[PDB]
Amino acid sequence: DLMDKEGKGLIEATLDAVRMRLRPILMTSLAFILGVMPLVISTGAGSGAQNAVGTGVMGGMVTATVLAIFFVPVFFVVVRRRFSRK
Amino acid sequence: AIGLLVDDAIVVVENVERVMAEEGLPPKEATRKSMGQIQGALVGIAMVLS
Amino acid sequence: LPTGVGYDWTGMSYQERLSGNQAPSLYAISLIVVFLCLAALYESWSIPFS
Amino acid sequence: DRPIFAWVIAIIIMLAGGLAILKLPVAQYPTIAPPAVTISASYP
Amino acid sequence: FGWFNRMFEKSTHHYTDSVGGILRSTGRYLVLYLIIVV
């Protein structure tokens, strides 16, 4: 929405985009993990199925944000896929 | 679902909150052109979640 | 074993199990619909691969 | 009007359409006649 | 509070300048993505 509508930014539009939304990526991710916290442990008798659900998403969200918003793709991708050839 | 529920609500509210600071503007029209950026996703994500 | 002795799998199990056979096909169409929906609101051949 | 969006509607028909041929009867003509029940006893 | 002063420091410094660092490179972090798939 910045590349087309506004200005290109070969690498300075993807970087300028997270400059104005590191907030909601860590607002959802942090609030989600805390809402799944009661299932991961806490309840340990009433229903053991709670532990089966919350373990598979709490572990997956730490790695789907402290990884996505950084280091490995979700930034790197848009570079080599759109740019670099066509 | 609770997770994929307050997430969709989060993007609508806080993207206005930046629009009310980036270019300090409280009014109704601040909320309208916030959906210029968001609406494109809103329906897009709805399809790929399905 | 000797003649006049065959077999038939009795008898709750199954009709195409879950971790196996099923799962592969379910995730396969999940990639074909994710790719198409990321394109209806984007128009490219690069954005959806991200 | 636009390329992508229209072609993606047609690609839904490529799957779901060719999925109906893999998941629906392939037989002769359908049910035609009024369906009848038939009793049959035997006194030898 | 100092909670807002921290959020603006990490996001703007720190994170966004280290996003400039990762974007300069490419071949190392792609081979790291492939090591994640292994």
Tab-separated table of C-alpha atoms in Angstrom:
chain	number	residue	atom	x	y	z
A	1	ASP	CA	0.000	0.000	0.000
A	2	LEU	CA	3.147	2.142	0.281
A	3	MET	CA	4.987	0.691	-2.740
A	4	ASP	CA	2.195	1.374	-5.243
A	5	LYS	CA	-0.108	4.099	-3.825
A	6	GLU	CA	2.710	6.082	-2.153
A	7	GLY	CA	6.438	5.623	-2.978
A	8	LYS	CA	8.294	2.550	-4.287
A	9	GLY	CA	10.897	1.904	-1.579
A	10	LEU	CA	12.823	-1.041	-3.050
A	11	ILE	CA	13.827	-2.068	0.480
A	12	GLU	CA	12.665	1.136	2.243
A	13	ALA	CA	8.915	0.421	1.970
A	14	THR	CA	8.938	-3.028	3.609
A	15	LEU	CA	11.150	-1.493	6.318
A	16	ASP	CA	8.943	1.620	6.501
A	17	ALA	CA	5.873	-0.634	6.842
A	18	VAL	CA	6.935	-2.365	10.086
A	19	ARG	CA	8.099	1.062	11.282
A	20	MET	CA	4.336	1.681	11.578
A	21	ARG	CA	3.135	-1.710	12.910
A	22	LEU	CA	5.499	-3.456	15.324
A	23	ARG	CA	2.701	-2.543	17.763
A	24	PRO	CA	-0.155	-4.857	16.581
A	25	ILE	CA	2.127	-7.852	15.882
A	26	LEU	CA	3.209	-7.906	19.552
A	27	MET	CA	-0.236	-6.823	20.839
A	28	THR	CA	-2.022	-9.857	19.382
A	29	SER	CA	0.830	-12.322	19.960
A	30	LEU	CA	1.329	-11.393	23.624
A	31	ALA	CA	-2.418	-11.244	24.375
A	32	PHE	CA	-3.021	-14.600	22.643
A	33	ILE	CA	-0.344	-16.511	24.562
A	34	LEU	CA	-1.699	-15.218	27.898
A	35	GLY	CA	-5.249	-16.271	26.966
A	36	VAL	CA	-3.970	-19.778	26.152
A	37	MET	CA	-1.968	-19.852	29.430
A	38	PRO	CA	-4.785	-21.480	31.493
A	39	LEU	CA	-4.722	-24.505	29.132
A	40	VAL	CA	-0.959	-25.084	28.744
A	41	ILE	CA	-0.657	-25.907	32.454
A	42	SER	CA	-2.734	-24.394	35.347
A	43	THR	CA	-5.695	-26.813	34.931
A	44	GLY	CA	-4.223	-30.282	35.512
A	45	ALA	CA	-7.163	-32.610	36.224
A	46	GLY	CA	-10.544	-31.196	35.147
A	47	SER	CA	-9.628	-31.795	31.510
A	48	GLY	CA	-6.268	-33.067	30.251
A	49	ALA	CA	-7.329	-32.156	26.704
A	50	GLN	CA	-6.725	-28.472	27.543
A	51	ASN	CA	-2.995	-29.270	27.750
A	52	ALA	CA	-3.097	-30.871	24.278
A	53	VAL	CA	-4.499	-27.722	22.608
A	54	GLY	CA	-2.550	-24.952	24.341
A	55	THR	CA	0.846	-26.663	24.028
A	56	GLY	CA	0.602	-26.824	20.225
A	57	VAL	CA	-0.160	-23.092	19.797
A	58	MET	CA	1.778	-21.405	22.639
A	59	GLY	CA	4.979	-23.012	21.361
A	60	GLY	CA	3.994	-22.193	17.787
A	61	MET	CA	3.269	-18.499	18.491
A	62	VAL	CA	6.609	-17.759	20.166
A	63	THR	CA	8.119	-19.090	16.916
A	64	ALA	CA	5.530	-17.448	14.607
A	65	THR	CA	6.371	-13.934	15.884
A	66	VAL	CA	9.863	-13.915	17.444
A	67	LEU	CA	11.025	-15.184	14.036
A	68	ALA	CA	8.352	-13.823	11.671
A	69	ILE	CA	8.709	-10.172	12.734
A	70	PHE	CA	12.508	-10.733	12.630
A	71	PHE	CA	15.379	-13.021	11.501
A	72	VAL	CA	13.710	-15.391	9.009
A	73	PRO	CA	11.200	-14.464	6.247
A	74	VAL	CA	8.250	-12.021	6.550
A	75	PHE	CA	10.612	-9.309	5.187
A	76	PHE	CA	13.229	-11.439	3.441
A	77	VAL	CA	10.540	-13.091	1.301
A	78	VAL	CA	9.105	-9.903	-0.254
A	79	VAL	CA	12.663	-8.972	-1.326
A	80	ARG	CA	13.617	-12.037	-3.414
A	81	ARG	CA	10.076	-12.872	-4.639
A	82	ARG	CA	8.758	-9.536	-5.949
A	83	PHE	CA	12.117	-7.830	-6.578
A	84	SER	CA	15.322	-9.409	-7.992
A	85	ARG	CA	13.672	-10.380	-11.326
A	86	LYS	CA	9.997	-9.445	-11.870
B	1	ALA	CA	-11.199	-19.141	18.370
B	2	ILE	CA	-10.727	-16.534	21.140
B	3	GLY	CA	-7.231	-16.123	19.688
B	4	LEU	CA	-8.358	-15.626	16.084
B	5	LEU	CA	-11.080	-13.191	17.213
B	6	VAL	CA	-9.489	-10.420	19.323
B	7	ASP	CA	-6.729	-10.463	16.679
B	8	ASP	CA	-9.120	-9.293	13.941
B	9	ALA	CA	-10.505	-6.678	16.355
B	10	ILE	CA	-6.976	-5.548	17.312
B	11	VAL	CA	-6.036	-4.430	13.778
B	12	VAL	CA	-9.117	-2.202	13.376
B	13	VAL	CA	-8.666	-0.347	16.689
B	14	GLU	CA	-4.906	0.249	16.966
B	15	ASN	CA	-4.336	1.196	13.304
B	16	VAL	CA	-6.624	4.163	13.972
B	17	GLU	CA	-4.639	4.797	17.186
B	18	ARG	CA	-1.503	5.386	15.089
B	19	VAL	CA	-3.516	7.513	12.639
B	20	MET	CA	-4.385	9.601	15.747
B	21	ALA	CA	-0.687	10.402	16.363
B	22	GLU	CA	1.233	9.940	13.096
B	23	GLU	CA	-1.061	12.757	11.930
B	24	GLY	CA	-2.897	13.660	15.163
B	25	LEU	CA	-6.557	13.347	14.147
B	26	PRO	CA	-9.368	12.091	16.458
B	27	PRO	CA	-12.434	12.458	14.143
B	28	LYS	CA	-14.658	10.052	12.160
B	29	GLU	CA	-12.684	10.637	8.938
B	30	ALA	CA	-9.525	9.405	10.689
B	31	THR	CA	-11.339	6.080	11.174
B	32	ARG	CA	-12.513	6.012	7.532
B	33	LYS	CA	-9.133	6.298	5.783
B	34	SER	CA	-7.648	3.876	8.324
B	35	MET	CA	-9.787	1.259	6.538
B	36	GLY	CA	-8.041	2.315	3.312
B	37	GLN	CA	-5.061	0.272	4.511
B	38	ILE	CA	-6.930	-2.379	6.532
B	39	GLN	CA	-10.026	-3.282	4.451
B	40	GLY	CA	-7.806	-4.720	1.702
B	41	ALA	CA	-6.482	-7.283	4.178
B	42	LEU	CA	-9.716	-7.790	6.188
B	43	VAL	CA	-11.443	-9.611	3.298
B	44	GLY	CA	-8.189	-11.100	1.971
B	45	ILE	CA	-7.292	-12.794	5.286
B	46	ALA	CA	-10.922	-13.933	5.689
B	47	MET	CA	-10.503	-16.017	2.517
B	48	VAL	CA	-7.107	-17.619	3.322
B	49	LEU	CA	-8.181	-18.430	6.890
B	50	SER	CA	-11.049	-20.331	5.241
C	1	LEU	CA	-1.481	-71.109	6.218
C	2	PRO	CA	-3.304	-74.204	4.819
C	3	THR	CA	-6.032	-74.201	2.147
C	4	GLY	CA	-9.536	-72.918	2.882
C	5	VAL	CA	-8.252	-70.228	5.252
C	6	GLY	CA	-8.302	-66.552	4.238
C	7	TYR	CA	-8.824	-63.308	6.157
C	8	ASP	CA	-10.944	-60.171	6.587
C	9	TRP	CA	-10.079	-57.210	8.833
C	10	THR	CA	-12.626	-57.305	11.680
C	11	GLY	CA	-13.838	-55.110	13.011
C	12	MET	CA	-13.812	-51.531	14.002
C	13	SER	CA	-10.957	-50.348	11.962
C	14	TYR	CA	-11.234	-48.529	9.780
C	15	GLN	CA	-12.013	-46.557	6.635
C	16	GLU	CA	-9.038	-44.331	5.762
C	17	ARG	CA	-7.170	-43.232	8.916
C	18	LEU	CA	-6.169	-39.737	10.025
C	19	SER	CA	-2.431	-39.469	10.663
C	20	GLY	CA	-1.786	-40.775	7.162
C	21	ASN	CA	-3.940	-41.057	3.990
C	22	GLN	CA	-6.474	-38.356	5.029
C	23	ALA	CA	-4.100	-35.667	6.389
C	24	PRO	CA	-1.998	-35.487	3.161
C	25	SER	CA	-5.066	-34.794	0.960
C	26	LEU	CA	-6.532	-32.249	3.415
C	27	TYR	CA	-3.323	-30.180	3.566
C	28	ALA	CA	-2.912	-30.491	-0.227
C	29	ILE	CA	-6.127	-28.618	-1.068
C	30	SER	CA	-5.303	-26.257	1.829
C	31	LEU	CA	-2.311	-25.088	-0.257
C	32	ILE	CA	-4.300	-24.869	-3.518
C	33	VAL	CA	-7.007	-22.628	-1.993
C	34	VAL	CA	-4.537	-20.510	0.038
C	35	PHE	CA	-2.635	-19.733	-3.181
C	36	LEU	CA	-5.776	-18.724	-5.115
C	37	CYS	CA	-7.241	-16.522	-2.353
C	38	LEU	CA	-3.877	-14.736	-2.034
C	39	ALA	CA	-4.241	-13.293	-5.550
C	40	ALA	CA	-7.939	-12.351	-5.602
C	41	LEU	CA	-7.007	-9.288	-3.491
C	42	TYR	CA	-3.364	-8.778	-4.605
C	43	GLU	CA	-2.666	-9.506	-8.313
C	44	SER	CA	0.929	-10.753	-8.715
C	45	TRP	CA	3.142	-13.872	-8.835
C	46	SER	CA	5.319	-13.153	-5.782
C	47	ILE	CA	3.165	-11.764	-2.933
C	48	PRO	CA	1.446	-15.134	-2.218
C	49	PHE	CA	4.768	-17.015	-1.970
C	50	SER	CA	5.745	-14.842	1.020
D	1	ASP	CA	-12.096	-5.863	-15.587
D	2	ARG	CA	-9.130	-7.327	-13.680
D	3	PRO	CA	-7.103	-10.454	-14.586
D	4	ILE	CA	-6.265	-12.316	-11.313
D	5	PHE	CA	-9.633	-12.077	-9.464
D	6	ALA	CA	-11.691	-13.384	-12.406
D	7	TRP	CA	-9.250	-16.246	-13.097
D	8	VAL	CA	-9.367	-17.301	-9.414
D	9	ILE	CA	-13.166	-17.662	-9.622
D	10	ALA	CA	-12.573	-19.993	-12.594
D	11	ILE	CA	-9.927	-21.967	-10.648
D	12	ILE	CA	-12.527	-22.673	-7.937
D	13	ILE	CA	-14.509	-24.346	-10.739
D	14	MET	CA	-11.377	-26.257	-11.848
D	15	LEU	CA	-11.183	-28.038	-8.471
D	16	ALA	CA	-14.796	-28.288	-7.207
D	17	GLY	CA	-15.986	-29.131	-10.728
D	18	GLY	CA	-13.413	-31.869	-11.291
D	19	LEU	CA	-13.991	-33.017	-7.690
D	20	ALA	CA	-17.664	-33.762	-8.406
D	21	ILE	CA	-16.610	-36.222	-11.137
D	22	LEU	CA	-14.398	-37.996	-8.556
D	23	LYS	CA	-17.166	-37.946	-5.896
D	24	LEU	CA	-20.570	-38.633	-7.495
D	25	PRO	CA	-22.335	-41.550	-9.286
D	26	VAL	CA	-21.236	-42.400	-12.856
D	27	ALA	CA	-24.011	-44.857	-13.761
D	28	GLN	CA	-26.719	-45.246	-16.439
D	29	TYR	CA	-29.970	-43.209	-16.541
D	30	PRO	CA	-31.351	-42.204	-13.106
D	31	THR	CA	-34.504	-43.394	-11.283
D	32	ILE	CA	-37.357	-43.301	-13.828
D	33	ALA	CA	-40.309	-45.547	-12.975
D	34	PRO	CA	-42.603	-45.225	-9.937
D	35	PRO	CA	-40.836	-47.338	-7.254
D	36	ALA	CA	-42.644	-50.596	-6.408
D	37	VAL	CA	-42.355	-53.218	-3.661
D	38	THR	CA	-42.833	-56.918	-4.487
D	39	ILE	CA	-44.106	-59.640	-2.133
D	40	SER	CA	-43.283	-63.313	-2.815
D	41	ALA	CA	-44.529	-66.349	-0.855
D	42	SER	CA	-44.226	-70.045	-1.769
D	43	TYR	CA	-46.512	-73.041	-1.141
D	44	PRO	CA	-44.710	-76.132	-2.536
E	1	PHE	CA	5.548	6.120	32.416
E	2	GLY	CA	8.840	4.494	31.444
E	3	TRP	CA	6.834	1.741	29.715
E	4	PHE	CA	6.153	4.019	26.729
E	5	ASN	CA	9.765	5.258	26.698
E	6	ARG	CA	10.934	1.629	26.455
E	7	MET	CA	8.498	0.624	23.688
E	8	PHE	CA	9.643	3.560	21.517
E	9	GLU	CA	13.329	2.771	22.156
E	10	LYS	CA	13.274	-0.952	21.251
E	11	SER	CA	10.951	-0.451	18.266
E	12	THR	CA	12.776	2.533	16.734
E	13	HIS	CA	16.459	1.784	17.506
E	14	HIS	CA	17.389	-1.397	18.106
E	15	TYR	CA	14.800	-3.301	16.092
E	16	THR	CA	14.411	-1.118	12.985
E	17	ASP	CA	18.182	-0.604	12.528
E	18	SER	CA	18.750	-4.335	13.045
E	19	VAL	CA	16.089	-4.819	10.337
E	20	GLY	CA	18.373	-2.763	8.088
E	21	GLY	CA	21.228	-5.109	8.998
E	22	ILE	CA	19.396	-8.327	8.097
E	23	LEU	CA	18.182	-6.819	4.791
E	24	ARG	CA	21.755	-6.029	3.682
E	25	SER	CA	22.545	-9.739	4.020
E	26	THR	CA	20.401	-12.432	2.361
E	27	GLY	CA	22.301	-15.643	1.578
E	28	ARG	CA	23.059	-16.460	5.230
E	29	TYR	CA	19.502	-16.064	6.571
E	30	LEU	CA	18.069	-18.038	3.617
E	31	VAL	CA	20.412	-20.944	4.400
E	32	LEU	CA	19.177	-20.587	8.006
E	33	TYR	CA	15.560	-20.896	6.803
E	34	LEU	CA	16.580	-24.106	5.006
E	35	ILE	CA	18.210	-25.404	8.217
E	36	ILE	CA	14.885	-24.772	9.998
E	37	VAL	CA	13.100	-26.999	7.445
E	38	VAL	CA	15.646	-29.801	8.038
